[PDB]
């Protein structure tokens with residue numbers, strides 16, 4: 275048909291309390307492009323994660339992450355939309371003072387059906403399920419070869435200005451390859467959002483309530499990545515000029531109730547820009 279394209283840049287931040295120092299902030303630059311015809315979406319992304327910049331470069335384990343995906347929109351229509359994504363991703367780890375470690379490259383393969391089913395003129399049952407295989411350098415990297423993920427639930431529309439999404443979120447890492455044991459975990463949350471849609475402004479308060487969560491790792495005392503889920507309240511802002519230029523702001527406070535002397539607390543901040551054409 276016609277072709278559509280986007281390009282954008284997002285910069286995110288993730289902190290931990292207190293003052294302190296617990297050590298001491300992540301930074302997540304990233305850029306994307308997508309296109310754009312028909313039931314076909316082509317996407318590529320570049321992401322990178324590491325400690326808060328200050329680079330001599332005396333950094334700390336960081337990692338970069340090319341991404342490519344293609345999405346096929348089988349059926350779209352007000353009754354029952356259905357869709358699919360295959361994805362490939364590469365984690366390019368660079369360890370900095372982790373004895374026994376220099377560098378890793380683990381791949382992730384992704385198969386994610388998605389859906390939007392009408393229930394009434396005010397209720398929808400939308401969602402995505404996502405199946406992954408992770409490939410090389412697992413021992414080094416700690417991932418677990420297989421992982422399921424899904425966020426699905428109900429949307430109710432008060433009117434063109436206010437909506438309510440309440441979802442079940444589930445994330446299981448497990449190993450298909452007995453015997454490997456590394457990165458096994460399970461997360462369950464309820465997620466609730468109230469997308470406010472005020473002309474060009476867009477605000478969404480939201481929250482994640484953990485149902486049950488267990489891991490194999492970050493407690494006493496392992497380093498941090500995927501995944502990695504916390505109770506949070508957050509708010510997302512978004513503005514569309516109709517240029518084709520949008521920007522966004524998001525902030526979220528996350529906690530973990532504990533039995534130590536008190537409890538671990540996190541901050542997320544996140545600005546984006548997107549341009550359509």
Ligand SMILES: CCCCCCCCO[C@@H]1O[C@H](CO)[C@@H](O)[C@H](O)[C@H]1O
Nearest residue numbers: 282283284285301303304305326327
């Ligand atoms: C893909 C590129 C998106 C924009 C990159 C983020 C721009 C800011 O880069 C920033 O340098 C500054 C040091 O004062 C700080 O504000 C940030 O912590 C640092 O990462």
Ligand SMILES: CCCCCCCCO[C@@H]1O[C@H](CO)[C@@H](O)[C@H](O)[C@H]1O
Nearest residue numbers: 275276277278279308309310311316
């Ligand atoms: C990644 C997007 C590819 C777009 C190709 C379909 C046509 C849209 O843009 C196209 O660029 C092509 C060369 O790049 C030419 O064949 C077309 O004449 C030009 O219109």
Ligand SMILES: CCCCCCCCO[C@@H]1O[C@H](CO)[C@@H](O)[C@H](O)[C@H]1O
Nearest residue numbers: 275276311312313314346347348358
């Ligand atoms: C720009 C739109 C033209 C369609 C691009 C080629 C695909 C047309 O063919 C489609 O592909 C599907 C596989 O994804 C199959 O279910 C069927 O062969 C068909 O519906």
Ligand SMILES: CCCCCCCCO[C@@H]1O[C@H](CO)[C@@H](O)[C@H](O)[C@H]1O
Nearest residue numbers: 381382383384385406407408409410
């Ligand atoms: C045969 C080894 C790879 C050859 C290059 C292209 C074929 C890759 O095909 C497969 O993609 C799968 C995605 O689900 C992965 O699980 C596998 O690691 C891979 O072998």
Ligand SMILES: CCCCCCCCO[C@@H]1O[C@H](CO)[C@@H](O)[C@H](O)[C@H]1O
Nearest residue numbers: 394397427428429430438439440441
């Ligand atoms: C995301 C918002 C959650 C509320 C929507 C689902 C509430 C579950 O309630 C259900 O709703 C159906 C629609 O009338 C009723 O017909 C069912 O009998 C009832 O069990």
Ligand SMILES: CCCCCCCCO[C@@H]1O[C@H](CO)[C@@H](O)[C@H](O)[C@H]1O
Nearest residue numbers: 426427428440441442444462464485
């Ligand atoms: C509208 C939002 C729906 C919330 C549903 C909460 C209960 C979900 O059902 C869940 O199915 C899981 C499959 O992994 C089981 O393992 C869990 O025991 C069960 O709680």
Ligand SMILES: CCCCCCCCO[C@@H]1O[C@H](CO)[C@@H](O)[C@H](O)[C@H]1O
Nearest residue numbers: 286402425467469478480510524544
């Ligand atoms: C994972 C790194 C942070 C990116 C967060 C994107 C915006 C806020 O996270 C939420 O995720 C949902 C996924 O189903 C989106 O549908 C919501 O609109 C969005 O508010």
Ligand SMILES: CCCCCCCCO[C@@H]1O[C@H](CO)[C@@H](O)[C@H](O)[C@H]1O
Nearest residue numbers: 281282283284285521545546547548
């Ligand atoms: C995606 C590309 C981003 C380029 C952004 C360049 C603009 C720099 O952003 C700066 O914001 C500050 C607010 O604290 C103001 O004080 C400055 O006037 C402004 O230049």
Ligand SMILES: CCCCCCCCCCCC[N+](C)(C)[O-]
Nearest residue numbers: 440466467468479480481507509
């Ligand atoms: C189960 C229904 C729950 C309603 C959904 C509202 C979730 C948003 C959380 C609000 C936090 C934002 N606030 C109010 C502090 O500004």
Ligand SMILES: OC[C@H]1O[C@@H](O)[C@H](O)[C@@H](O)[C@@H]1O
Nearest residue numbers: 359384386388402403404423
């Ligand atoms: O569509 C929302 C997307 O969010 C991402 O964070 C998930 O990893 C994808 O599987 C999902 O499709």
